[PDB]
Design a binder for these strands. Structure first.
Lengths: 234, 135, 91
RNA sequence: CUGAUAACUUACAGGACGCUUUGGCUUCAUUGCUUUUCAGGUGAACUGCCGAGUAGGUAG
């Protein structure tokens, strides 16, 4: 069982994946897009439970579009910040636990890191579910792309990062997970009534595969100290 | 009526239908009824034969009992095409003697436009000919 | 409820005429007018932004106390033509 | 359940004036393409009449 979500054209995303890197959005944001799609189907079919996912990126285009904030209370605008935005077009393949077209469309989450995520109506035909990996990757259109595996080789430093960047220019650092500063406790106000901790961004290098499967499929691992969206092989 | 052939050769089967139309016209001495083929295509005469102005003759009744039968434009015989064969060129010179025969010469280049001969024979003699029929 | 619309326009301009896309907002440390853009096929192309488009659908507010022209819907609904605030909290 | 939730960057504009690239020039000697080769379906759509007829008509 494999489910195919093709052509998720996102208009205005954050290129700020970290307080450090500007480029493709943090892989935790791609995980939030998948897990909110997992959580919307559980209203109707409550046993769905996505295990992993695979990302096929076309067409980044990172730009310095601005962001006009609204007026705040003595009424003026707040302080201004340079804004980096990007326009990701990608096909998402998810490994389902085990569905109508009307259920798959209305359960799509409508944001991917602050950006309007949409599928065209003429691409609603290509939301079919497949049982093998070969038939799913032959099914999707927009053939040129990358498949986004993690680069696992000894980057303990920015000089270790930039040494990998100058060898292959398209190597695309981003935010991969979160690193806790303190163990989660009970706070008087936390977003939706859970334990709150204070974390920091983890930067990893992101490869690309011509296309074996465990290098591609990303999933969220939970450790006591930190949380990272890893591929299944690593 | 139109007789449509459904079993083959449309050449040597439409020529048999005209021989029955031939022998009918000397029993009764009538020349009114004519013949035409709606499907007169280039490849073949066709599978359709119609008479305008025969089905009570012994040929059409016995052929009806088997599985195969059903029971503006002008179709005329061109006997100038019978003269274009080299046996007919020698028939033409024998009349003109009855005189240098070496003064004659062949055409060496002739073009013929869609002659559609149906093969038949004579019963008065034992002799064969063709039905070179055009539009 | 979902309700997708796909809108497509067809503008017949004069010969060789101007188009006016949206333009960027950046901090200052020579180019005085920089357009917002995407990549369509293999080329750059002017766009008219997603927040700019949503502000045009939401120009509804003609119920402020001296209403002539409809304003963009928001808190203490501001006018950016004349730098004022209709629906100021003193009202 | 996404460094979450919300987000209009706008207005105006004349790059212009002037301009000699030129002089000179040897591509040239030699040369064997050869040997051998079945296009066949022609039993047949004939024999008379008319006409001054290599024209043109018709009989079985």
């Amino acid at each position: 069982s494999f489910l195919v979500l093709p052509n998720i054209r996102v208009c205005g995303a954050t290129a700020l994946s970290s307080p450090v890197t500007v480029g493709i959005p943090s892989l935790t944001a791609f995980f939030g897009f998948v897990h909110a799609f997992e959580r919307n189907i559980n209203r109707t079919t409550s046993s769905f439970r996505v295990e992993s996912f695979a990302i096929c990126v076309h067409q980044l285009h990172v730009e310095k579009r601005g962001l006009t904030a609204e007026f705040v209370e003595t009424i003026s605008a707040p302080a201004t910040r340079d804004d980096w935005q990007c326009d990701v077009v990608f096909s998402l393949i998810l490994n389902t636990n085990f569905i109508d077209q009307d259920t798959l469309v209305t359960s799509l989450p409508k944001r991917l890191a602050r950006g309007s995520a949409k599928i065209a109506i003429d691409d609603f035909k290509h939301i079919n579910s497949f049982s093998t990996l070969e038939t799913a990757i032959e099914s999707l259109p927009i053939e040129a792309g990358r498949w986004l595996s993690l680069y696992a080789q000894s980057n303990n430093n920015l000089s270790d990062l930039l040494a990998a960047m100058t060898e292959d220019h398209q190597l695309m650092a981003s935010c991969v997970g979160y690193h806790l500063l303190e163990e989660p406790k009970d706070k008087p106000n936390s977003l939706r009534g859970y334990k709150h901790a204070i974390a920091e961004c983890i930067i990893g290098l992101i490869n690309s595969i011509t296309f074996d499967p465990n290098t591609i499929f990303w999933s969220l691992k939970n450790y006591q100290n930190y949380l990272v969206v890893q591929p299944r092989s690593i | 009526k139109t007789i449509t052939f459904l079993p083959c050769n449309n050449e040597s089967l439409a020529a048999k239908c005209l021989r029955v139309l031939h022998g009918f016209n000397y029993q009764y001495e009538t020349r009114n009824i004519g013949v035409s083929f709606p499907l007169w295509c280039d490849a073949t005469v066709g599978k359709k034969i119609s008479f305008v102005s025969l089905l009570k003759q012994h040929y059409f009744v016995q052929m009806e009992q088997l599985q195969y039968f059903h029971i503006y434009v002008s179709f005329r015989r061109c006997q100038s095409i019978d003269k274009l064969t080299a046996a007919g060129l020698a028939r033409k010179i024998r009349r003109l003697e009855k005189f240098d025969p070496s003064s004659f010469a062949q055409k060496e280049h002739t073009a013929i436009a869609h002659y559609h001969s149906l093969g038949e024979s004579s019963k008065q003699t034992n002799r064969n000919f063709r039905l070179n029929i055009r539009m | 409820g979902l309700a997708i619309f796909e809108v497509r326009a067809t503008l017949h301009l004069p010969t060789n005429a101007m188009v006016r896309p949206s333009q960027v907002f950046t901090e200052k440390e020579q180019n005085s007018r920089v357009f917002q853009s995407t990549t369509i096929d293999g080329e750059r192309s002017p766009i008219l932004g997603a927040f700019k488009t949503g502000a045009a659908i939401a120009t509804i507010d003609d119920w402020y106390p001296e209403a002539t022209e409809p304003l963009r819907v928001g808190r203490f609904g501001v006018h950016r033509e004349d730098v004022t605030c209709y629906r100021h909290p003193s009202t």
